[PDB]
Amino acid sequence: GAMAPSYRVKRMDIAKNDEECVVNAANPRGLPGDGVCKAVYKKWPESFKNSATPVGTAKTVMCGTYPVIHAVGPNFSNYTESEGDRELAAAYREVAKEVTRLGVNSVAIPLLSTGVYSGGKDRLTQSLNHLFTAMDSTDADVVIYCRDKEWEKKISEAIQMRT
Ligand SMILES: [Cl-]
Ligand SMILES: [Cl-]
Ligand SMILES: [Cl-]
Numbered sequence: 001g002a003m004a005p006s007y008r009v010k011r012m013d014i015a016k017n018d019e020e021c022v023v024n025a026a027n028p029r030g031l032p033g034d035g036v037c038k039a040v041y042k043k044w045p046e047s048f049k050n051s052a053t054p055v056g057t058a059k060t061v062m063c064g065t066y067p068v069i070h071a072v073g074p075n076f077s078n079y080t081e082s083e084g085d086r087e088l089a090a091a092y093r094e095v096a097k098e099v100t101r102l103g104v105n106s107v108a109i110p111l112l113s114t115g116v117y118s119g120g121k122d123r124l125t126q127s128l129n130h131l132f133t134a135m136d137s138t139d140a141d142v143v144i145y146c147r148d149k150e151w152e153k154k155i156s157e158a159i160q161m162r163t
Pocket of ligand 2: 112
């Protein structure tokens with residue numbers, strides 16, 4: 001575990017993370033995809049061997065000794081708000097299980113279902129609160145990666161509010 005487990009946020013490409021493992025915002029089919037998934041495919045393409053996994057689940061595949069946790073959030077274009085909310089919460093609970101199993105002291109995480117799976121809605125708070133619910137009982141240092149300037153401020157504020 002980390003000596004004083006923390007949450008931090010950085011605005012940059014998650015493929016340049018300084019953590020002991022990465023969470024991929026994956027598709028269920030283990031395809032290269034777009035956005036975070038494509039950056040992860042270019043950096044760790046070996047990790048996409050047998051990475052296909054259902055919505056609401058996470059599947060880890062090693063790239064050398066570096067763990068890539070493929071977490072499949074729901075596409076809110078297809079799911080109801082109610083069923084999408086349940087799958088998005090579940091995906092993050094499966095990430096917490098994998099992070100614990102791997103024994104890492106740190107993890108780089110994106111906000112699941114906030115990009116092309118958002119169904120055109122702002123889900124910063126929804127996705128971040130499910131991340132916190134899952135990760136608060138882990139002792140890994142969590143570093144959240146985003147790409148928007150206003151989102152960096154809102155994530156930072158939400159971390160600081162809990163102290
Ligand atoms: Cl960058
Ligand atoms: Cl997304
Ligand atoms: Cl963002």
